Amino acid sequence: RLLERLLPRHDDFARRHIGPGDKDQREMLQTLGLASIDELIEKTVPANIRLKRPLKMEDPVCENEILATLHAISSKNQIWRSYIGMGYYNCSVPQTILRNLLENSGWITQYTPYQPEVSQGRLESLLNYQTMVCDITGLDMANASLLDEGTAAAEALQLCYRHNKRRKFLVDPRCHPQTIAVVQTRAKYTGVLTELKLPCEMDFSGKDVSGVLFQYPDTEGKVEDFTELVERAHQSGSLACCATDLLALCILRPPGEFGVDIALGSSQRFGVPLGYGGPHAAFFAVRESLVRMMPGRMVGVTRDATGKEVYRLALQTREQHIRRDKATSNICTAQALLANMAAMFAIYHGSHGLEHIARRVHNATLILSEGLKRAGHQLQHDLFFDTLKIQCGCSVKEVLGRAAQRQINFRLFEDGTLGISLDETVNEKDLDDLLWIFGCESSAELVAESMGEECRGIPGSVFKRTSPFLTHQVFNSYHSETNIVRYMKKLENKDISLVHSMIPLGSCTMKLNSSSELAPITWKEFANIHPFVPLDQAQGYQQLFRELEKDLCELTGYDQVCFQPNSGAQGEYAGLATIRAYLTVCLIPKSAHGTNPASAHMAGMKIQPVEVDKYGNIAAIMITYPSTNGVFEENISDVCDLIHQHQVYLDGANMNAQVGICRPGDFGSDVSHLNLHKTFCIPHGGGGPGMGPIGVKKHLAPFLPNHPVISLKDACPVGTVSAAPWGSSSILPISWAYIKMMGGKGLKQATETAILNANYMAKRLETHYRILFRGARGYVGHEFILDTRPFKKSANIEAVDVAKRLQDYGFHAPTMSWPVAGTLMVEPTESEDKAELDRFCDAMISIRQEIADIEEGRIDPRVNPLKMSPHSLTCVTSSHWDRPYSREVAAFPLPFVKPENKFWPTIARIDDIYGDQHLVCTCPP
Amino acid sequence: ASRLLERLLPRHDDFARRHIGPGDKDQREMLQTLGLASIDELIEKTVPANIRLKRPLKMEDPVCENEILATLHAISSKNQIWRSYIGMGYYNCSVPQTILRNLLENSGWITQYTPYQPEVSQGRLESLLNYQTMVCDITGLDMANASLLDEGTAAAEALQLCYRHNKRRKFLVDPRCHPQTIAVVQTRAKYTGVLTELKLPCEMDFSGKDVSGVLFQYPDTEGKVEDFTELVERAHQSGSLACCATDLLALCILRPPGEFGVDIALGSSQRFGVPLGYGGPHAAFFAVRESLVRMMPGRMVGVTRDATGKEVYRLALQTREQHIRRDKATSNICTAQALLANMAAMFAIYHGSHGLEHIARRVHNATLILSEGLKRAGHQLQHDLFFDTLKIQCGCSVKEVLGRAAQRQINFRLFEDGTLGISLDETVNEKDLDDLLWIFGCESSAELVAESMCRGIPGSVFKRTSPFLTHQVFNSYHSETNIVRYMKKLENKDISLVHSMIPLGSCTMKLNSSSELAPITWKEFANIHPFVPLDQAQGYQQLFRELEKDLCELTGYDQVCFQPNSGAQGEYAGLATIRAYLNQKGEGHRTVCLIPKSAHGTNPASAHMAGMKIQPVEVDKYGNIDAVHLKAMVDKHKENLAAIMITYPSTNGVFEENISDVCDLIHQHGGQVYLDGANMNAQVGICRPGDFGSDVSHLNLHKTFCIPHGGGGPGMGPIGVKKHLAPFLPNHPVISLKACPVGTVSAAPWGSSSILPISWAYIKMMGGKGLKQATETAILNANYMAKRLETHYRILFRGARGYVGHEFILDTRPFKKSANIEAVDVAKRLQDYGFHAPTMSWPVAGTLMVEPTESEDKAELDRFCDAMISIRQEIADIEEGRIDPRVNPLKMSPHSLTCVTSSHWDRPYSREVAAFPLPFVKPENKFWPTIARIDDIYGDQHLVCTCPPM
Ligand SMILES: *Cc1c(COP(=O)(O)O)cnc(C)c1O
Ligand SMILES: *Cc1c(COP(=O)(O)O)cnc(C)c1O
């Protein structure tokens, strides 16, 4: 149009997202000996599996309009005061943690702390989170987060099965309903029988029961003594698992002190938004003797090469990347970032501030309780923390009518009674609205005057907490705003992130997490809605779900998406369970991510491994296209046809090599998870949050996950896989914004440049290191493997030496020893420009020459920069220097590493064995 | 006495507990160190009894931090965000979100102040050098400063520069300059003694050789692009200078002032990625020819060497500024708009010349399109050639147009003569063009108008053909990934409040809280045009009233004027109001202003700018105003006495015993009392300047009331006045503030309105109790530090009973004789201990002045005292011969990373002593000075004030 020539688009976000401009791409193409981008794709991606017609999507939205566009959606939501409860409680998110951690690119762009020596910040903070959970729950050791409350409870069930092998598990029906549904789904496919029984109905006599799950306080609000239940279970060989609340436990005697084996719940009310379901770090802590069976990551204390006390992920042999189908769970990405928010919450308040918040909430509930009783309403339970169950003396409708006038939501119980869960945000004004809602012609002031100040409730009961918590210096040091900012910065600056340098982690897609994408996750219209609100309050979210679904259906070739799964691994489990509901043998290549076999074990499938040939190539199969080695298989249609002849799950984690070029649904796949936090810009967050939505073909849609609280429907659902119906809803705007900004053209170009960048790097490094696997005509997809294994024989150099030595050149290492042990796998993504790629290649080329010096007797084979790496500031600034290379070689190996940009590894090399032999997983004194 | 509810259900939080560092335990220990039982005893012994409050501050109940944003939202949502195409120097722009998030809302960019200590400030120094380079390239002039306050104040500075250059008393102003620009220039001329004349180029008479300079605008306020070559040449042939107000976006496609002979180019940098802000803050630009640079106002970054010979940055030719030359300085300006200059530089780095040309072409073509649509519809365009601004005579009724405009919530500029101004901007899309065309009754769409259309600037002789932004810095960081990395690189070179206490005397480096900062980027504050109709800014009005009333109550004044956009502007404004009052009263012969020699350099400069005869008053050996010399000087000038400028407490941190007497004395002899409020952090909740005889004070919101220091701006300097001065307070020619106004001192009626919420939020969160406690702890902390250092260094001045206020001076001068150690040695050596130095060599040369503020806790204060105590022992080593006097830690400081990690080490102390002097300085928190010691003389001898190659 002539308008478009006179008045072009204001901006094109693809130009900001994609690093290499025109000049870079031409030069990279010259380096590959190719005339154009299309030629590269034609020589990489098999012709017969490419798209017929280009992605059909909306015209791209300029970056300078994306927030107004999205506001037109989010403003459709209504922000009521929700006192629904059910595991989500509004809280006061300290603005300084929101600003300096959540909206800080130096906290949120890094991923899992695999490389500890450039990750001590987030490792300390996750150690703070564990310490907090252990102190408050009263149990011995806690993990570095699970996905949500209900999954954490399923993991408790699974832990119990792993401990004693018994096929029965008793559930208290007073657990939250979404918790029950997720535990029953896991039990169903793991082969364990669950029974809904109250403590008095629970029969342990038969010595068949693995464990019991109850809640404290329970879903109705009641505080109950489980000492006797726990003792009865113990005398019959069963374990006792307790879902709980960290705020409640600030004044309640905790599960640890009435014999509980496993304590779990959500950390959400410790300073994290409602988020319309997530993301929230769940907690999960166990007795000392159960720790070998712990799920997820767990920070421990160890030594470095100098003997300094330092942090690192401990007992890693439990996890998916080592033990695969024999692992303690399929979980990979958890909710590291939001665990760190909650730990900062507890550091900022201290035990003293958490007691103040908890007492205040409880007294506000006690006050409301007396007001309602005065007015002729009936309270079902005398002792509670923050939650009342009310039989209305007057009409329930007229109450709800008034409640609607003050825009307040209650929990509507099946039996016609009401749930009210007060929280940290509740003040006098709200109590007055609440008392007016129930027709009590008395204010909160006046009700309080005739209560007196004899202690009542929890402080006046035998359930009074007497044990201390958060006595470590870290929880009693950073209470001024000035101090917490300084502390958050100190830990930030220890962690190498995307504000520093490329993090080319294979199968992680460390691409740009844009500001404009990130902004909306802290908008009140997304962050401050309770997941279980009536749907007329969440019509903005509905529209977001539809638009993102439709877009994702179009990129993948599937028919319907389910947002419920809140990690890739959860999507695999969900996808496999949907295949089983539609219908047990699951074929899995040995090249598959460790989540693949673990998910299948969790979904109750018999795993048959399939071998990989020497060129790297190969109820259901799990495939990945491209290969977890970055190579496109020539005849993937044939594999899909073959399985269908006798369903096909396709792992989507490598979709950044596909988008706008080919689609898994077009070539025979029935179901895929997508990693939104890897391909679609959700921030990696130090190891979470992520989302793992599954696209399915028409025929699987009737069996997709449902939810017992908010209904997601010929339906025949597999069950329920996450605590919240659409998982971590509040981070979904990030991927919607990427997609709507990029458009069809931009998304295609991003995939193009991801492949270009990976091949350019491989090309540059091919005469220095072996590129282990390639496609039929020699080209890789979006990543490649450098075979460092030969340097073991020639120089006694291991991949780990190269990993640590890279830190000295200003780079986080690529992915290590997977899919192939003793190798590096490299994924630059599209967001990094030529000069950044050239620095990484030059660092590797220079390291190659260091290996050559050892291979040639030019430098001591025991004491060289590779074996002594990383080189800390304390090492390099010491007066003591007794090494046969200079300090310049150690810390500034090439001229692009300058004092002006020098990132310091904060410690010497990590000792892996020592920490697991001296297991300490709480902040030491 | 409390309600039962308040005991069962106390306040959710108290922000004073987060703002004030020392808790109960700290304060008890500090009190023990002072030998005092309680806080009240301290105050009783510090602040004289007779000037203290008779009753507590009467203020609203404090607002919990967890409700402050909801409370403020109830005010801000009263504003209406229309699409404003008013123009008049403010043009909506698309603020790149990544710069907003990673710079504006980064505490690592905004908490630091003026880059006095260059070796821990190279980041923001490079960025200000980027800003200068950008201005110089785009304007085509030789050297630019590191920001002025706004467009109109920059134009007044041009007038003043011209007077300084040639001493002629006439200055010609084009009436097609923006009206607020004219009003601010006329106000400055009025009190400086220069006569302005409003004359069009053809009416301008340069032939008498009595014209200092001329000011015109390009494009002018009506939108027109005109050739000023001949005007400039005529002025030059008669000895006058030519000053040009301009627009940086416009100049991306227009040949700039540099290429038609202009001597001074200025304007606002606001379009380059900074919000409308309902007036501010925006960095103004100001650039000059090579030969005029000695007379430059403000700061200016220059290139120099460090001790190793490395190329590095620092503030250049500092002898021009207020802190050195005082009343002989090139201006009174101190705090400028450093942070917003850095935003605009990042804007230009992110877009490059190529992206700025794209934005500018797009805006211009959007205007050309609108232009053809209006002509088709029967409306008359007054000027053929424009950038983004049309002047329209409506073919139909103006009312029916404005009626329709109101229906699409669009504002135009209403000219006095019944015509309309429309200024398009970067935010204007097809949809808006269509609304605009519908507004004027053109039934054609933008698409259709465009189909029947190079013309405009590209088709004219005004086409820009000169390049700009050819340096690598403007062609390197176009990916979002790169610009984030670049902003971080510069952030991490700058020590800030995310690292350690910055105890800068006379700066009040207190907490800039997140919850206070959050609202400044709310659309309801950030995206309103300063000249909108007032029914669109009723939230702002309510904010102004509430903050005014609160500030009136803390100060004892009757009315506040928010127009002045720095403390120094408030001084100038306050002094000018005193002169207008005196003129009204029959007493304009009174021009003498008495100023103690201890006064901030802004004091004498402001008085010179306001046209007062300065008489210095001496200070005695005890640090007080010399009562004999004062009495003499009062008597000498009693018939001509206009004012005194005092500071309570003194600029040395001491409370004067008889300040009432000083005020009474001046009032006895026919003059008014101006009180410099910059030290109000020692007063709030305890005493009030209005109660003891003061008539007028500026307050520094960016010092006492939590506005972020921003690397040297932004600030606000509101003046409180007594009833009798209120009729003479500044007004504004566009939005009426009323009366017999002094004139207009800032471009925007309430200055930088969008940062005012920060101080409102501090005040409403703290309450009467919290504000008092903050002042209490500021005084406690300062005395505790002085107490701990008194046997190692001389505390130069104290109050009558031995106690200081909120700051104190360490007399380091004796170490010159005993060890050949200068204050600067101590300043640089402190960097090695992880601290930015305190304020240096003012009020007393060769000394350090220390202000911890209330926001820092005991352990942080103890770290600073231990660093000083340890440095004392280093000085002792030189005094007693234990270490070389030339080569020791103090003389070699700061110690950079490159120095300490070198293989070559030839110093008589260890690397550990150099970089980790005490155990609290650890690898895990080590802040590195990024360069060796700065060479001060070399840079001023080899003046280079733009980014050098590569
Ligand atoms: C990264 C990745 C996953 C991620 O699973 P999460 O639970 O989201 O961490 C799964 N599969 C493959 C092949 C991956 O590369
Ligand atoms: C900071 C200051 C000023 C002027 O403030 P600006 O905002 O920089 O103009 C005046 N007097 C004293 C004592 C100051 O500290």
Angle ∠(A395,A397,A400) on CA atoms, nearest 5: 115
A611 alpha-carbon distance from chain centroid: 31
Within 8 A of B66 by CB-CB distance, chain A residues are 92, 424-425
Q: How far apart are CA B124 and CA B136, in angstroms?
A: 18
CA distance readout (Å), A199 to A185, A203, A389: 22, 9, 20
Query: At residue A323, what is the residue type?
Result: R
- Name the residue in chain A with its Cα closest to that of B915: A877
CA distance readout (Å), A142 to A159, A294, A912: 14, 8, 20
Is A416 strand, coil or helix? coil
- DSSP 8-class letter at B246: E
CA distance readout (Å), A229 to A139, A187, B788: 18, 22, 61
Q: Please say whether the beta carbons of A119 and A494 come within 8 A.
A: yes
Q: Please say whether the beta carbons of A269 and A152 come within 8 A.
A: no
Is the minimum CB–CB distance between A323 and chain B shorter than 8 Å? no
Q: How far apart are CA A528 and CA B919, in angstroms?
A: 45
Q: What is the largest CA-CA distance in chain A?
A: 92
Taken in order B741, B742, B747, B749, the sign of the CA dihedral is negative
Q: Please say whether the beta carbons of A202 and A227 come within 8 A.
A: no
Angle ∠(A288,A291,A292) on CA atoms, nearest 5: 135
Is B861 strand, coil or helix? helix
In degrees to the nearest 10, what's the CA dihedral of B881, B884, B886, B888?
-110
Instruction: Work out which ligand 2 atom sits closest to the CA atom of B717.
Output: 7
Q: In what order do the strands lie in the sheet with B420-423?
A: B380-381, B389-393, B420-423, B413-414
Query: At residue A138, what is the residue type?
Result: G
Number of domains in chain B: 1
Q: How far apart are CA A174 and CA B3, in angstroms?
A: 38
The neighbour count for residue A862, using CB atoms within 10 Å, is 9
Is B391 strand, coil or helix? strand
Instruction: Give the pair of three-digit tokens for residue B194.
Output: 């220069």
Helix, strand, coil percentages in chain B from 3-state DSSP, rounded to 5: 45, 10, 45
Q: Please say whether the beta carbons of A73 and A544 come within 8 A.
A: yes
Instruction: Work out which ligand 2 atom sits closest to the CA atom of B716.
Output: 7
CA distance readout (Å), B331 to A740, B40, B319: 51, 42, 11
Is B932 strand, coil or helix? coil
B127 alpha-carbon distance from chain centroid: 17
DSSP states along B61-111: PPPPHHHHHHHHHHHHTTS---EE---TT-------HHHIIIIIT-HHHHS
- Say which residues have a Cβ less than 8 Å from residue A440's Cβ, sequence separation at least 6: A371, A372, A374, A375, A447
Interface test with A, best of B3, B9, B927 (most A CBs within 10 A): B9
Q: Please say whether the beta carbons of A737 and A17 come within 8 A.
A: no
Taken in order A233, A239, A243, A249, the sign of the CA dihedral is positive
Q: How far is A240 from chain B (nearest CA, A)?
A: 35
Give resolution, Å, one decimal.
2.3
Within 8 A of B5 by CB-CB distance, chain A residues are 367, 428, 444-445, 448-449
> In B813-829, which positions are buried (b, 16+ CB within 10 angstroms) versus exposed (e)?
bebeeebebbbbbbbbb
- Say which residues have a Cβ less than 8 Å from residue B372's Cβ, sequence separation at least 6: B449, B452, B453
CA distance readout (Å), B123 to A842, A908, B210: 27, 29, 45
Query: At residue B925, what is the residue type?
Result: N
DSSP states along A634-686: TTHHHHHHHHHH--EEEE-TTGGGTTTT--GGGGT--EEE--TTTTS----TT
Name the residue among A654, A902, A894, A755 with its Cα closest to residue A20.
Answer: A755
CA nearest ligand 1 atom 14, residue: A653
Helix axes A66-74, A732-765, angle to 10 degrees: 140
- Domain boundaries, position B181: 1-950
A373 alpha-carbon distance from chain centroid: 43
Length of chain B: 950
Q: Is B89 left (phi over 0), alpha (psi -120 to 50) or beta?
A: left
Q: How far apart are CA A5 and CA B446, in angstroms?
A: 12
Q: Please say whether the beta carbons of B322 and B506 come within 8 A.
A: no
Name the residue among B825, B12, B309 with its Cα closest to residue A358.
Answer: B12
First to last CA, chain A: 70
Select from A331, A332, A735 the residue to mutate for testing ligand 1; criterion: most ligand atoms less than 8 Å from CB. Answer: A332
> In B779-798, which positions are buried (b, 16+ CB within 10 angstroms) versus exposed (e)?
bbbbbbbbbbbeebbebbbb
Length of chain A: 925
In degrees to the nearest 10, what's the CA dihedral of A550, A552, A557, A563?
-90
Check whether the bond before B118 is cis (ω within 30° of 0): no
Is the minimum CB–CB distance between A525 and chain B shorter than 8 Å? no
For β-strands A648-651 and A282-286, DSSP reports them as: unpaired
Q: How far apart are CA B355 and CA B494, in angstroms?
A: 29
Question: Tokens 């790097």 correspond to what residue?
Answer: A761
The neighbour count for residue A609, using CB atoms within 10 Å, is 14
In degrees to the nearest 10, what's the CA dihedral of B932, B937, B943, B944?
10
Instruction: Work out which ligand 1 atom sits closest to the CA atom of A690.
Output: 8
A311: which strand partners? A301
Q: What is the 3-state secondary structure (H, E, C) of B210-226?
A: CEEEEEEEECCCCCECC
Q: What are phi and psi of B747, to 5 degrees?
A: -60, -35
Is the minimum CB–CB distance between B535 and chain A shorter than 8 Å? no
DSSP states along B502-564: --BTTT------HHHHGGGG-HHHHT--TTS-GGG-HHHHHHHHHHHHHHHHHHT-SEEE---
Name the residue among A64, A302, A177 with its Cα closest to residue A706.
Answer: A177
Inter-chain residue contact A887 with B903, CB threshold 8 Å: yes
Instruction: Give the pair of three-digit tokens for residue A600.
Output: 């299948």
DSSP states along A51-116: -SS----PPPPPGGGHHHHHHHHHTTS---EE--BTTB------HHHIIIIIT-HHHHS-----SG
CA distance readout (Å), B732 to A93, A609, B223, B531, B744: 42, 80, 22, 11, 5
DSSP states along A697-761: -GGGGGGS---SSS-----------SSSTTSSGGGHHHHHHHHHHHHHHHHHHHHHHHHHHHHHH
Name the residue among B315, B335, B314, B287 with its Cα closest to residue B161.
Answer: B287
Q: What is the largest CA-CA distance in chain B?
A: 91
Chain B, 56-95: which have a CB under 8 Å from a chain A CB?
A: 65-67, 69, 94
Q: How far apart are CA B150 and CA B131, in angstroms?
A: 15
The neighbour count for residue B908, using CB atoms within 10 Å, is 11
Structure solved using which method?
A: X-ray
CA nearest ligand 2 atom 2, residue: B678
Q: Long-range pairs for B56-60 at CB < 8 Å and ≥24 separation?
A: B56/B685, B56/B768, B56/B772, B57/B553, B57/B554, B57/B685, B57/B768, B57/B771, B57/B772, B58/B553, B58/B768, B59/B550, B59/B553, B59/B763, B59/B767, B59/B768, B59/B771, B60/B764, B60/B767
Name the residue among B757, B791, B790, B784 with its Cα closest to residue B21.
Answer: B784
Inter-chain residue contact A877 with B499, CB threshold 8 Å: no
Q: How far is B771 from chain A (nearest CA, A)?
A: 16
Is the minimum CB–CB distance between B857 and chain A shorter than 8 Å? yes
Q: Is B469 left (phi over 0), alpha (psi -120 to 50) or beta?
A: left
Instruction: Give the pair of three-digit tokens for residue A34.
Output: 């190719």
Question: Tokens 């030529």 correspond to what residue?
Answer: A834
Q: How far apart are CA A485 and CA A492, in angstroms?
A: 10
Q: How far apart are CA A845 and CA A852, in angstroms?
A: 11
In degrees to the nearest 10, what's the CA dihedral of B588, B590, B592, B593?
-80
Instruction: Give the pair of three-digit tokens for residue A871.
Output: 């080189």
- Say which residues have a Cβ less than 8 Å from residue A816's Cβ, sequence separation at least 6: A114, A799, A800, A803, A823, A824, A825
Q: How far apart are CA A707 and CA A178, in angstroms?
A: 7
Name the residue among B442, B483, B443, B476 with its Cα closest to residue B343.
Answer: B483
Q: How far apart are CA B403 and CA B393, in angstroms?
A: 16
Is A282 strand, coil or helix? strand
CA distance readout (Å), A177 to A389, A708, A721, A726, B693: 16, 7, 13, 16, 70
Is the minimum CB–CB distance between B366 and chain A shorter than 8 Å? yes
Instruction: Give the pair of three-digit tokens for residue A24.
Output: 């870079």
DSSP states along B867-916: HHHHHHHHHHHHHTTSS-SSSSHHHH-S--HHHHT-S----SS-HHHHH-
Select from B321, B335, B701 the residue to mutate for testing ligand 2; criterion: most ligand atoms less than 8 Å from CB. Answer: B335
For β-strands A168-171 and A193-196, DSSP reports them as: parallel
Burial zone of B710 (CB within 10 Å; 0-12 exposed, 13-18 middle, 19+ buried) = buried
Instruction: Give the pair of three-digit tokens for residue B117.
Output: 């200590």
Within 8 A of B94 by CB-CB distance, chain A residues are 10-11, 63-64
Name the residue among B157, B144, B135, B287 with its Cα closest to residue B569.
Answer: B157
Angle ∠(B568,B574,B579) on CA atoms, nearest 5: 130
Ligand 2 centroid, distance to B605 Cα (angstroms): 12
Angle ∠(A541,A544,A547) on CA atoms, nearest 5: 150
Inter-chain residue contact B430 with A7, CB threshold 8 Å: yes
Q: How far apart are CA B928 and CA A638, in angstroms?
A: 60
B410: which strand partners? B83
Taken in order B290, B294, B300, B301, the sign of the CA dihedral is positive
B827 alpha-carbon distance from chain centroid: 24
Q: How far apart are CA A236 and CA A207, in angstroms?
A: 5
Name the residue among B548, B537, B546 with its Cα closest to residue B78.
Answer: B537
- DSSP 8-class letter at B753: G
Is A514 strand, coil or helix? coil
Q: Please say whether the beta carbons of A561 and A553 come within 8 A.
A: yes
Q: How far apart are CA B347 and CA B274, in angstroms?
A: 9
Chain A, 405-444: which have a CB under 8 Å from a chain B CB?
A: 424-425, 427-428, 431, 444
Instruction: Work out which ligand 2 atom sits closest to the CA atom of B508.
Output: 15
Q: Please say whether the beta carbons of B88 and B532 come within 8 A.
A: no
Query: At residue B544, what is the residue type?
Result: F
Ligand 2 centroid, distance to B823 Cα (angstroms): 22
Burial zone of B443 (CB within 10 Å; 0-12 exposed, 13-18 middle, 19+ buried) = exposed
Q: What are phi and psi of A650, to 5 degrees?
A: -115, 120
Q: Please say whether the beta carbons of A148 and A88 come within 8 A.
A: no
A609: which strand partners? A588
Is the minimum CB–CB distance between A369 and chain B shorter than 8 Å? no
B559: which strand partners? B721
Burial zone of B309 (CB within 10 Å; 0-12 exposed, 13-18 middle, 19+ buried) = exposed
